[PDB]
């Protein structure tokens, strides 16, 4: 007894009459690349993704963030191509690349990355950590306003808060130094919540900090709706997440 396939079978579009004249992979890398592509496509048979892949909702995630910035691609592309020509024209650049002695300035890369791809990389990273799932019940937003939180440790050092880097409760004893780029006349609200700190209820959080009606970026002048409480992750309970939401 046989049963007809429920859909197109693999290796079906291959014409078996002209096998000798057909192009072969010839390389392991070219097969793997095609293999990885086929594994990602939806199939009508049972697959590993069916049983182990997280069950994402079919409806797209509602965007609740700020509108994307408007940029002129034509002008932006023109300036970018011109810059590459200037860099490539320099003879000292070519010798450094040919002799493998050239390097990029990490400080400048981060400044540009923070202006360009920073927001989307932070969103992708926030989704991985489960913040959007827990904080907004799946709704996502692009953090388009860079937020720089730093805990003063000692008198000459700072402990910057990025997106998942570890900070100890001792370093976070006092309220952090919060600075962001804001225009005059705007108002902002800053809060600090421990997603995992709550002891009695699993789905609830702890509000460690709340500042409201902040004029511009002068966080000190905001109303202390909730005073600051340092994190208190319980012993043996694991690693908790504390998120600053501007």
């Amino acid at each position: 007894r046989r049963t007809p396939p429920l859909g197109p079978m693999p290796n079906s579009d291959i014409d078996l009459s002209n096998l000798e004249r057909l192009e072969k992979y010839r390389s392991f890398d070219r097969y793997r690349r095609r293999a990885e592509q086929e594994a990602q496509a939806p199939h009508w048979w049972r697959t590993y993704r069916e049983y182990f892949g997280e069950k994402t909702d079919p409806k797209e995630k509602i965007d609740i963030g700020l509108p994307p910035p408007k940029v002129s691609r034509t002008q932006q592309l023109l300036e970018r191509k011109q810059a590459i020509q200037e860099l490539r024209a320099n003879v000292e650049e070519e010798r450094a690349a040919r002799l493998r002695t050239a390097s990029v300035p990490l400080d400048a890369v981060r400044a540009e990355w923070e202006r360009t791809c920073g927001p989307y990389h932070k969103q992708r990273l926030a989704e991985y950590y489960g913040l959007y799932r827990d904080l907004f019940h799946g709704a996502t937003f692009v953090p388009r306003v860079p937020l720089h939180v730093a805990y003063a440790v000692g008198e000459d050092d700072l402990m910057p808060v990025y997106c998942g880097n570890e900070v100890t409760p001792t370093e976070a004893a006092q309220a952090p130094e919060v600075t962001y780029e804001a225009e005059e006349g705007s108002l902002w609200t800053l809060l600090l919540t421990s997603l995992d700190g709550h002891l009695l209820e699993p789905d609830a959080e702890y509000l460690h900090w709340l500042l409201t009606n902040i004029p511009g970026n002068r966080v000190a002048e905001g109303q202390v709706t909730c005073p600051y409480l340092p994190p208190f992750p319980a012993r043996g309970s694991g690693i908790h997440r504390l998120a600053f939401l501007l």
Partner: protein, 157 residues
């Protein structure tokens, strides 16, 4: 499983040509030539080797199957010259002749004209091109001569 719709999803040997552990020459059809031997003879080994490499790579670009690429045995020739005011020939130079063969198959009847025009224009100086049809004699000419078989065969004669 046999009864299930996914039966045969793991089949793969119909996608590979069968392997069989000399070689029959395929005579061409009315619209395609048979196995063709492209001989490249030059007094310089680098020029023959370089052009044989060019023809091989060009055939790959044109999807012309290259059956085999091989070198024929080198021929050394002594060049004696009659000395001035003398009747004795003295050794002047020793010139070696190097030959390379790029064996192709499946060349089209119409495209043969375009192929030949390209491979003659790029011919280096001092390199001779000779496109012949493959025969058993060409293949047998690559093997050592057997004197013992000749003596035993002579007795039968």
């Amino acid at each position: 499983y046999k009864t299930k719709p996914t039966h045969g999803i793991g089949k793969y040997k119909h996608l590979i040509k069968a392997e069989e552990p000399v070689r029959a020459i395929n005579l061409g059809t009315d619209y395609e030539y048979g196995v063709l031997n492209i001989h490249l003879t030059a007094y310089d080994m680098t020029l023959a080797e370089s052009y044989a490499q060019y023809v091989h790579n060009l055939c790959n670009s044109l999807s012309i199957k290259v059956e085999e690429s091989y070198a024929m045995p080198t021929k050394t020739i002594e060049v004696l010259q009659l000395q001035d005011q003398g009747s004795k020939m003295l050794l002047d130079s020793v010139l070696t002749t190097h030959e390379r063969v790029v064996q192709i198959s499946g060349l089209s009847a119409t495209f043969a004209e375009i192929f030949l025009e390209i491979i003659q224009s790029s011919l280096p100086e001092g390199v001779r091109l000779s496109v012949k049809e493959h025969t058993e004699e060409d293949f047998k000419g690559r093997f050592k001569a057997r004197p013992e078989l000749e003596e035993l065969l002579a007795k039968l004669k």
